[PDB]
Amino acid sequence: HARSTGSYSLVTQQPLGGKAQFGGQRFGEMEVWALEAYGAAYTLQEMLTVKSDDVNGRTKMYKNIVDGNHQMEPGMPESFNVLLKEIRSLGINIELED
Amino acid sequence: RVTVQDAVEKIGNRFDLVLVAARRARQMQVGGKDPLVPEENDKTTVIALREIEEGLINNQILDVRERQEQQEQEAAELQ
Amino acid sequence: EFDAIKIALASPDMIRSWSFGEVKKPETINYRTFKPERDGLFCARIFGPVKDYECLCGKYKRLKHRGVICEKCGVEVTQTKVRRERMGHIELASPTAHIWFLKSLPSRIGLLLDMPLRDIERVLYFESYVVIEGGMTNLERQQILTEEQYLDALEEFGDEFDAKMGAEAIQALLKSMDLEQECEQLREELNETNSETKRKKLTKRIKLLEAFVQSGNKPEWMILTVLPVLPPDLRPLVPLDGGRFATSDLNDLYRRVINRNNRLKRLLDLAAPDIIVRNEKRMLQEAVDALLDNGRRGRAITGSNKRPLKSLADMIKGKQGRFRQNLLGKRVDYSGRSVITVGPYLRLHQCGLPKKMALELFKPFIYGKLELRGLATTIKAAKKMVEREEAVVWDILDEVIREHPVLLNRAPTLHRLGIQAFEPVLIEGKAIQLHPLVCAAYNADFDGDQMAVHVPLTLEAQLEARALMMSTNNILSPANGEPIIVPSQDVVLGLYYMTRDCVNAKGEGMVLTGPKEAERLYRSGLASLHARVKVRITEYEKDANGELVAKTSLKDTTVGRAILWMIVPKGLPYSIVNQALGKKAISKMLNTCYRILGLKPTVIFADQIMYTGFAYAARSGASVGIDDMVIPEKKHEIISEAEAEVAEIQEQFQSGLVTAGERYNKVIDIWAAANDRVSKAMMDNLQTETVINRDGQEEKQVSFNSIYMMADSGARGSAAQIRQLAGMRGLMAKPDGSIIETPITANFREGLNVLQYFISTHGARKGLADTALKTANSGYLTRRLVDVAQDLVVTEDDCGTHEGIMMTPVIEGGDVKEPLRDRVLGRVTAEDVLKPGTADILVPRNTLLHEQWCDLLEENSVDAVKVRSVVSCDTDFGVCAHCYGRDLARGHIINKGEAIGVIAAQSIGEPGTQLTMSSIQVKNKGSIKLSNVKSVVNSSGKLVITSRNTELKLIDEFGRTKESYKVPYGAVLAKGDGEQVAGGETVANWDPHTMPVITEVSGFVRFTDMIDGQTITRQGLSSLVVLGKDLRPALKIVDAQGNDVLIPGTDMPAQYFLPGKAIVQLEDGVQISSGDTLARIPTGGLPRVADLFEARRPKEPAILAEISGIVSFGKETKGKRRLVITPVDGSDPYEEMIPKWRQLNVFEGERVERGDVISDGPEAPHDILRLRGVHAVTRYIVNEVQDVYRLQGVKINDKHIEVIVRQMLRKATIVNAGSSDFLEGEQVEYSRVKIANRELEANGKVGATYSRDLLGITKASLATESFISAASFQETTRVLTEAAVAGKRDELRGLKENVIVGRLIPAGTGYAYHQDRMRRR
DNA sequence: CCCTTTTTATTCACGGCGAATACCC
DNA sequence: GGGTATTCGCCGTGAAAGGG
RNA sequence: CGUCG
RNA sequence: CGACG
């Protein structure tokens, strides 16, 4: 089973999983630890921000691959925004400082 | 080649050579630069890593080349 | 964008300003229309509609009308992205309390107010009242009154008695209580310090009040007044088709909360009595309990079909939460998964990829190539050309899968070699071809295993996969300096069959001119493969600098070795080829080729070795059969004599001569001896079974059996499996702990019955359950071990330290286990090494120990080298490049910016699955050495000991130490100081049942205060047992003159107190001497690794001496036992107790010393750190972990344990505060104290005294400066409650904090980018 | 879309932390 | 007048559905 | 790691 | 959310 581009979930902006549904493979925490054992800065930056999150960034990355540019953008992960809206639903305030 | 060993002997950090090779291969693809070595059905990463090993492309060499290009751009915009 | 995350409490005005409207209707779905309702959880005027730029009525269809409001209900035009950020709020007519500030363990409200938790539960559940605004009242302000006390409490006091019930009373108690005067009175109460538990509780309350004062939050915000909701896009409700409707549980909980709030609002408008509004407030309290976090109480609600609903906190914590399944681990694109295949025609830097997977995973690259080549009109034409299976885009794939590496990955990942990079080729099939040389690092056999493949997109990701994650660059192990590319079973068998010695073959006794003639004679068939011939070889050496010399010689070798010499390059001599070439010989050859030539000729040499082995494995033709597993003809005789001996000892047991407890040991001993004899006969029959004649008489050589060739070369299978296969397998033990006395007689070649197959299945099921549980235990252990040292990056190159550890090979009592070369390899020493012979300087201070200084270190025969470690560093927030040393992956030093803690945790957690879940004499010759013992001469000419911490060493004739022993107190010595001993001679002899009471002086003994009936009992045997209550006896001695014998130097007289439960055989009035005792008194494995790393307290710990001084008995076990250790010039406010189970080892008339063991058993890891030192607990835990690892046979370097040890003691406490702002009872970081005292000790101010304390892998990971890495490790609610109360400000510094926010981790390029960002800022 | 009454009562290993009774000077 | 050793519980990880 | 509802 | 390898 292989997937380049497919559908995504509605509760979070992540690809699906399995063979009957068009989904990709799961990059677990041990793979993140094995990448952190190497340098893998831009490898980990493109693994969990460009391929899964950044719904406006992955389209720009696809257009850059189509036009012939191997350059990406950091963007903003949508799962962190979901977590920020989830903790704010309780009686705990959390925001980002500049 | 098949391995990256002599680039460690040239630059003994193995982190800045990747960045300067990406900076060399990016300007040869987006902007467009003349390759200093003859290519034989190779991509820009292998061309940049081959230009690293000979010594024509380095960190300070690329910095002074960018500075000379910016000085030529300001001299062209001045006239 | 942002650089810090600030967390605080939620003000109700902030929740009112966050939302845009108020909800009133509880209904969400009307089940008739597709549009949502105008008010509810799925609102349209608050959160927005679903369609982009379209209202509910259908009047706005143009984008130019954006900027107005709707007149029907108030639904403005929105997008699909802005609907996820709009929220709503719910007002509360009745106040309620929070759950995270109620059961935080300890409670925040219970710590802020002077009230236990049960009274707070009684007030919050409407069980009892609290008096508010008493004023001039004899009753206490926090007094609890029952239901019958309210009547006379209202009708007794003359003033107005107003007492609130519920959360309003708690809110009034919070509003009426101030903060500055309360903390002022608490600081005025600090000077009492009556009890130490009240002292630490009071300082904890002062720290909580100060954390409330310095923060910008209020204590009144714990009472919930305005409650925010989640957006409807975060809670998707897909309309299913069936008899029942599918919905989320959180929406049902919110609907129940809105229903209870609307019922309370309808109840307040009818002037209801107190009990019904009390029950309504209780139902609203249960509703807000079920909404926020359910399951913490005794009654967890169940929605449908007996299933507890997931609240807002249940979907965050745990394994299936958002931190572990949506932030650290995400689904990725451009990925595949197939079945692995061998594919022996590939190289090391390449793998095999199918055409369908390469066409699917590279669709946008093919599209971009078709756009740049000018072949397709648009992207849709290229898509139609791709999905129609044309023969036009096939040669375009040869240009994009040429120099583009992919990331191969196995589903279990233990270390960094589980993810490697290969250049994929296009093969035909549906499977991935994984190279056999990397299978030892992947630990993947081809019995249906699956692997994942990833495709990098960024140019920097491709360059990092090529330059760092390549398979040709990672050939060494991360735990030790050994090559991971080794021939496993087939290549080593081919190289063993090709290079072997024979006594007679075809073409023996002929001389050849070169290796090409030998290969031609082997391919032509005129000469055999294994024959002793003579060839002319030219070997190249590199003894000169700049050139390689050559030498021509003729050596007697084999034809197969002459063929293999063409594989061997010029950098290696002929001594590595002419050997037996087993399993370790090829690894030593590859290590020599890597250490002499380098990385470039080694990756071709290993591939050529694998190609030659795979080529000669087909030419060998090794097969197994019945005649290969031979049977010894003398086995049945040994079995017959063994059965006769068991029958004779059974007859002797049944006659009544030998008891069964020794007969069982005799039976199992003679069966083990018979098994060893059968195994020795089988090995002698296997290794010598073929005889080949040369001229006349015959000769005996090593046999050419296939199973013996597979067992001797180390190809596949150890010697124990061959012993269980050919010979008898031995005794099979019971799983409960015992072992059956009868073994398995028949082997696997012969037939078996059902009795010889039951205990083997018992042991196999026990081993299978053991490994199935211990692999999950090891996974949990390495998951705990990664998060301890996940934020240690090398930021400096040289710092300069004067302290260090004393690196020395440890001696357990027998021979050596770890030599000097494998302990100090690649580590910078601390100071100069002192020479015992001439006393000069060998090494400088800051120098690296390469492979040449270790030869001088072992030739000088040094004892201990002061080497800098990871714990004794001084770099702030990380270590330097000199305190670590070699990274065990490259020949040079470690570069700056490498996260070595994750590599250390991965190298520790990887072989954790292999872990299972009377007299002192010498052995060799040499001199002895006594330490910490005073020698007292005896009357017979021997020497007696008096100290308890004595230790004996063995010094050789050169000056080194090769043997050490530990003798307890009360043992005579046989050899003297400076006397050479021999092998097989006893030194110390003692009894482990009787403790000595023998003094060092002589004299006529005399009993004192021994009355029969009160303290002694006389009851053949002429002795009395020692058990007027508080009157202790004494043992005085009389000399020949008649006066008192006083010991010069010590003020204690010559008397001894008799201990309890001890017999005294000798009476008084006789001359005594030294040597006669007067009074005669009678888990390793992975849980051990978890106990050592978790720093848990033992079951029965030992008590260590705090200060040196004489001892004094306070009590004699009436209810307790108290001992006093008083010094000479000081007092002692320390009184310890005895748990009435530990044997008292310390006496009153012996030498005292701080640091002595008084109880047999394991010692606590906290007492050795605070009393002995800081470099003593570290070496002890490193040696214990290394002993547990060497019990199995794995090899892990000492730095990986030392970095975890350094991360363990990172926290510290303050003893004396002084002029600093920190208190004397708080636990802060050591780095903050180190950067705060540097400006205080250099100036005229005073500093604070600190003392390091040891923490486990769980307590030190959860207690840190950040609140994100501590919330995703084990728990979430407690650290979020602490971060909300204290108001911590997080800074993205470590590695785990950048994975959550999604940016660059501090790698080497990450350290470069972080230094550039710090330079720009 | 809303009240009520007769009883659904369902089983780990190991460790950290908080709280009600006590003997002795 | 007053306090910590011992013990015992709670928590951390791997009572509400039926008809009109 | 997958399959099913 | 449960069963199976």
Ligand SMILES: [Mg+2]
């Ligand atoms: Mg397998």
Ligand SMILES: [Zn+2]
């Ligand atoms: Zn409208």
Ligand SMILES: [Zn+2]
């Ligand atoms: Zn240092």
